[PDB]
Amino acid sequence: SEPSPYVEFDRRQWRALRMSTPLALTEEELVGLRGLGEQIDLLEVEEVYLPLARLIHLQVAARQRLFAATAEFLGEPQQNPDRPVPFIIGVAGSVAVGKSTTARVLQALLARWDHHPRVDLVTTDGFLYPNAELQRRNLMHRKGFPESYNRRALMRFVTSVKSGSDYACAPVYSHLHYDIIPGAEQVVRHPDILILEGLNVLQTGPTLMVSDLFDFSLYVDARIEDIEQWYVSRFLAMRTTAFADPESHFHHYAAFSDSQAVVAAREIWRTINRPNLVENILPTRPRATLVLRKDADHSINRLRLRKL
Amino acid sequence: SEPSPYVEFDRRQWRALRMSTPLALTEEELVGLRGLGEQIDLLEVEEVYLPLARLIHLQVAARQRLFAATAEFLGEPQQNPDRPVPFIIGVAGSVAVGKSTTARVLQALLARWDHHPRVDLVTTDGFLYPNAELQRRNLMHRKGFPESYNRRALMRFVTSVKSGSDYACAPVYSHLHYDIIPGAEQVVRHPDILILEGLNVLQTGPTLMVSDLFDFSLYVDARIEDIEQWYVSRFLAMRTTAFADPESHFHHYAAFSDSQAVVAAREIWRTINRPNLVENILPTRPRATLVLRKDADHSINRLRLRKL
Ligand SMILES: CC(C)(COP(=O)(O)OP(=O)(O)OC[C@H]1O[C@@H](n2cnc3c(N)ncnc32)[C@H](O)[C@@H]1OP(=O)(O)O)[C@@H](O)C(=O)NCCC(=O)NCCSSCCO
Ligand SMILES: CC(C)(COP(=O)(O)OP(=O)(O)OC[C@H]1O[C@@H](n2cnc3c(N)ncnc32)[C@H](O)[C@@H]1OP(=O)(O)O)[C@@H](O)C(=O)NCCC(=O)NCCSSCCO
């Protein structure tokens, strides 16, 4: 007898909402989107992602009719090929939670629909300030925090795209170089669906922000303590991986021993990622349209949907 | 070349968006909804309100199709007479801004449509805690502030109605008695549109709140300084009005002289209403779907719409 804005699901029940939804993705292509540590198999794609894709594609149609209503109020025509208001999806979660993978997968699944939609993916890491300006603000120790990103630029970019611009541009970020790529840019030209993935993308504030432009939002959740381990394991793993390359802004880590590294990583987590996570990311979870709850083994076996 | 989520209007331009919208309200009925101080004439109803009503009725249809999409995802039928998800409208603004009037008018205009919708109006003042419990919380001096209302109850009520409940109930408040009416209740039975009007109705928080359930939101704005005068004038005016009645929890004011009162009122404003206004209400203005900007003469001659 107690109504709720949320609907809780166990994967076993959620998996049934897939219905006819075809699986237009392969085992190959899947590993080509898989992220370091993420153990996502086709089964999870069919049981978790496909239902989500169906939910989203049902929403896109209706949400665009809603904007069209306002356009009709403004005496504004739907000139040219009815260029519907792009549908914006936000994907957030902690560092090392798996959100990068989630978004790449969602883009693929969402893209492979019979009416062939234009689906773009944009990570907000490209809106982080170059390291230079990052120190001119004494924020190199807070990289990842809301402040470390150019929120006005990010808001403009998304506002321009949802506004109907023929095109808009974003910077590009280099994870190896740990910094923005000079002159490098990412162009987005009037997509049917735009997905924005990043740490604080769901953050709120005194002024309208990108979170206020999302038509749907995804939050990748995990036991805080479980993510710490994922982060470390990935740290160590990366020693013999990305770091190795001398061009790694962190090559000085490759030489670390299991112990040393784990010690270094754990500290970084305690001083930067955990705080940002707790102070800025978690707080947004309640308003996310859909929460993907992962177990210590990376498997998403539980979800929380906002039906209201 | 700079896109915006907002569209600014002068009444002179906004008034044209009325189109064919019939004026189903009379000069009589209008004063029967007018509030103490509010100088709203039929002309403003036709130039300001009617366009708003048209905007809202265009939105209702589409917004309900959007929820129906989710319902379809959940394998949930639209059984019985497709009882569409009620459309919730929030109306906020400072004390003495005119929001009470605005909402009564909107209800009337919105109700008089050819398809005859069920439009309910609920002031959140009925969710204020009885004065008793108000002191058990040391909050009689903060009456009006978020804390003074039972936000869990309010959230339940609205969540129940938008949930599709055959009916839900709210307490009733007595402005003369300055307190909740014992055993008194207000029943709402599955409306097509529910309007919630009050001070902090747009407030946000760590948890989902009623603001998160609004399908549209109205903010009644005025120069902070201008509202102070409206408040006082209404104070003095009320001396020879509501107060007069000895049952007035404030009869002790009727005997005040122009000076005295103005002095009393101004202080109350400075210690209670202005702070709440500045600390809790104003902050919500940026996210309101539509802002009604009033001049010192109560005339709404400017507006800001959120098209995004
Ligand atoms: C920029 C930030 C916040 C990462 O932000 P994101 O939104 O990209 O989140 P996240 O780090 O989880 O995702 C990064 C993606 O890009 C990869 N990546 C992350 N950091 C690095 C890196 N340093 N070098 C190469 N690749 C990296 C990572 O593997 C992810 O790709 P996959 O989806 O294929 O697995 C993080 O790299 C950072 O610098 N944080 C400051 C605190 C901190 O963690 N300092 C230690 C830096 S060395 S440990 C590298 C892994 O965290
Ligand atoms: C409860 C609260 C916050 C009012 O909340 P609301 O959401 O109703 O806003 P607001 O006061 O603007 O609207 C009240 C409506 O109800 C009427 N009203 C307000 N206060 C009283 C009253 N005390 N006695 C009789 N009627 C009243 C007022 O005329 C409005 O009706 P109209 O639309 O027909 O004009 C206010 O009455 C209060 O007690 N505030 C605490 C600080 C304060 O103002 N203290 C002085 C109280 S005596 S001055 C009465 C006018 O403010």
Curated annotation (Swiss-Prot), chains A, B:
Localisation per UniProt entry: Cytoplasm
Entries under Pfam families matching the protein: PRK
Binding of ATP, residues: 93-100
Catalytic activity: (R)-pantothenate + ATP = (R)-4'-phosphopantothenate + ADP + H(+)
GO cellular component annotations of the record: cytoplasm; plasma membrane
Keyword annotations: ATP-binding, Coenzyme A biosynthesis, Cytoplasm, Kinase, Nucleotide-binding, Transferase
This protein's pathway: Cofactor biosynthesis; coenzyme A biosynthesis; CoA from (R)-pantothenate: step 1/5
EC number(s) per entry: 2.7.1.33
GO annotation terms (biological process): coenzyme A biosynthetic process
EC top class, as a word: transferase
Presence of keyword Transferase: yes
Superkingdom: Bacteria
Gene Ontology MF terms in the entry: ATP binding; pantothenate kinase activity
The UniProt record lists the keyword Kinase: yes
Similarity comment: family membership: Belongs to the prokaryotic pantothenate kinase family.
Miscellaneous: Was identified as a high-confidence drug target.
Protein name as it appears in the record: Pantothenate kinase
Organism: Mycobacterium tuberculosis (strain ATCC 25618 / H37Rv)
